[PDB]
Scaffold this active site. Sequence first.
Site, PDB file in Angstrom:
ATOM      1  N   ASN A 110       1.098  -0.675  -0.368  1.00  0.00           N
ATOM      2  CA  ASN A 110       0.062  -0.114  -0.228  1.00  0.00           C
ATOM      3  C   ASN A 110       0.699   1.161  -0.305  1.00  0.00           C
ATOM      4  O   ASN A 110       1.678   2.086   1.068  1.00  0.00           O
ATOM      5  CB  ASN A 110      -0.505  -0.131   0.923  1.00  0.00           C
ATOM      6  N   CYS A 128      -6.911   2.413  -4.328  1.00  0.00           N
ATOM      7  CA  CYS A 128      -8.587   2.188  -4.168  1.00  0.00           C
ATOM      8  C   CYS A 128      -9.134   0.321  -4.417  1.00  0.00           C
ATOM      9  O   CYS A 128      -8.032  -0.653  -3.814  1.00  0.00           O
ATOM     10  CB  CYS A 128      -9.115   2.835  -4.907  1.00  0.00           C
ATOM     11  N   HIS A 136     -12.347   1.518   2.542  1.00  0.00           N
ATOM     12  CA  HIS A 136     -10.843   0.683   2.356  1.00  0.00           C
ATOM     13  C   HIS A 136     -11.678  -0.356   1.470  1.00  0.00           C
ATOM     14  O   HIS A 136     -12.531  -0.725   1.466  1.00  0.00           O
ATOM     15  CB  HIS A 136     -10.742   0.411   3.853  1.00  0.00           C
ATOM     16  N   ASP A 141      -5.104  -7.818   2.063  1.00  0.00           N
ATOM     17  CA  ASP A 141      -5.708  -6.707   2.574  1.00  0.00           C
ATOM     18  C   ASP A 141      -4.473  -6.365   2.362  1.00  0.00           C
ATOM     19  O   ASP A 141      -3.629  -5.706   2.960  1.00  0.00           O
ATOM     20  CB  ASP A 141      -6.225  -6.744   4.220  1.00  0.00           C
TER      21      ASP A 141
END
Lengths: 76, 341
Positions: B9, B14, B255, B272
């Site tokens: 990340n 997105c 998220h 994630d």
Amino acid sequence: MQIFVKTLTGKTITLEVEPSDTIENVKAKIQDKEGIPPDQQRLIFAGKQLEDGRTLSDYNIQKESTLHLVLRLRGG
Amino acid sequence: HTGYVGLKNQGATCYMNSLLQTLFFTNQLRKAVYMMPTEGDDSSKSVPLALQRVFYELQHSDKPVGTKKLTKSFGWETLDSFMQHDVQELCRKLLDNVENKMKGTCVEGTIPKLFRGKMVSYIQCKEVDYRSDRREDYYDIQLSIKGKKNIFESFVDYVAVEQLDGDNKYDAGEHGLQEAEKGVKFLTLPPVLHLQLMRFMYDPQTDQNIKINDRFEFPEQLPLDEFLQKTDPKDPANYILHAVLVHSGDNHGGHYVVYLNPKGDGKWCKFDDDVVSRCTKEEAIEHNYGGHDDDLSVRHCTNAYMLVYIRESKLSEVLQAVTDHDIPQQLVERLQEEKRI
């Protein structure tokens, strides 16, 4: 030639177009009938996204073809 | 611990990481991507090479995989790029880009083989004996959610007939403009089924763009034979849930995560960004239905916006093993050299 546009509500409108119409021309005709500005329109035909500067003829679009309108929404 | 590696990340992207894992675990697609002839591609300007690189690192790296070279190849190097597009558009453009690169190769036609179905739009006039059909390809299905309990009800709505009248009468040739009805029928469903759930939309009432957080149920096993014009006795349209792309948030933003059972065997993981963890079936499926029970006590705004199903008869091929023997040596050598750093 009369094509169809499946709109945001899922309903279908008719649209009178010419094969020489640019995608920009088509978006303008959609605003004329549905009120959605061209910069908010994404048009999908047969799974492919139509691009400005090309014409309906570039895509094999014919009478009774359905363009799928999806709105450009900001996010992510 | 899962044996699957995450994506970094390193800037707001997105939905992108969710989609990248979803496509990476479409093994037959990944294999074809590795076969794309990128020997002569520009090492920076090539989307096909950049996707080969991300896939190669997802398959071989033990550390979270970066995506800066991929977003550079996209020319989507700021959040505004991702704000101006959605996951359906990213997916379609990515698949179209690698489909074009596969033309004239041993793997030409892989993207339509995996993702393309056929439908037919049929028109029947109400007062004159005139009817007409139009067949069209599709590569995903946009499903209405609002007011629908589940996938089944969304498919019923999708094939419901619509009246053509008023300012939208049908051009019936020699009959002129005619009141008519129009409907969709499915002719085929593809091996890999992408369902876009219409949670984000314009709302004419409040005159704004919204997210629908209502409850919408989707099954682990999805039988679709009843929506086909003709079925195949030796290949029923039974679909197996593979991926659940999830958004937590509201009209302001949120998220993104994705749940997958990569092998199609019901063993699920949560992806994630850099953190990949085992999860239960309930955590991947039922917990992402959405809903409003006890909203008074807490926001319930976590739910699925895209599902991937794989046809049962195609599962062992779509999810075939991808080995280093499948990866051309030219690609391996080019990537190893890149880490000249």
